[PDB]
Amino acid sequence: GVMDVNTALQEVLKTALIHDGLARGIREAAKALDKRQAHLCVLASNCDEPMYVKLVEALCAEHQINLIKVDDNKKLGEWVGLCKIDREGKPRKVVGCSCVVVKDYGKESQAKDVIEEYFKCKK
Amino acid sequence: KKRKKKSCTTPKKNKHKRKKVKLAVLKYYKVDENGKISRLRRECPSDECGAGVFMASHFDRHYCGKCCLTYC
Numbered sequence: 001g002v003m004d005v006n007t008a009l010q011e012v013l014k015t016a017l018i019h020d021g022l023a024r025g026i027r028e029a030a031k032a033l034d035k036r037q038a039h040l041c042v043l044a045s046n047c048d049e050p051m052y053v054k055l056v057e058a059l060c061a062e063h064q065i066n067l068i069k070v071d072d073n074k075k076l077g078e079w080v081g082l083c084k085i086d087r088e089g090k091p092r093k094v095v096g097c098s099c100v101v102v103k104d105y106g107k108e109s110q111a112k113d114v115i116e117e118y119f120k121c122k123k
Numbered sequence: 124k125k126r127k128k129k130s131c132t133t134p135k136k137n138k139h140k141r142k143k144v145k146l147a148v149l150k151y152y153k154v155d156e157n158g159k160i161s162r163l164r165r166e167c168p169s170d171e172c173g174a175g176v177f178m179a180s181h182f183d184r185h186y187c188g189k190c191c192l193t194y195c
């Protein structure tokens with residue numbers, strides 16, 4: 001694994017974007033993630049709602065799901081693919097996603113290297 | 124025949140505007156001190172919404188919004 005840990009979520013969410021396996025928004029995340037048809041879940045750390053931590057921490061706790069946390073809703077908004085771009089490629093518009101739920105992974109040696117390494121070391 | 128204007132009637136029939144509930148998704152689950160999950164409402168037996176969707180508690184009834192199931 002030549003990759004850094006923090007930059008490698010990009011391939012997981014890109015291939016989860018291509019295979020139509022991503023669920024964004026808290027309800028469509030939580031609900032479908034509680035259906036046990038979804039493997040892993042990506043969350044944001046910084047938030048203005050205290051209960052928003054409780055919900056998905058408890059959900060990820062009981063339902064045997066793994067918890068990743070990112071910096072702001074904005075960077076996660078850049079990962080999810082909701083960023084609208086300018087003429088020259090400027091990421092101008094950002095719709096932030098705190099909740100991300102992964103259902104169908106793609107097949108990648110990179111993002112799975114970093115995520116499996118990080119989660120083998122976390123356990 | 125020049126078309127008559129003639130607009131008069133019960134002055135306005137207003138179209139329903141969406142009721143915006145702020146963070147209403149959080150109301151469903153009850154989190155205790157241990158981090159346990161307590162579901163305050165009932166699960167729906169139907170196939171499509173099974174295990175992923177819950178029902179509503181109205182005083183006399185239970186209502187799911189997907190398949191429109193109803194109980195007393």
Ligand SMILES: [Zn+2]
Pocket residue numbers: 167168169172176187188189190191192
């Ligand atoms: Zn139903």
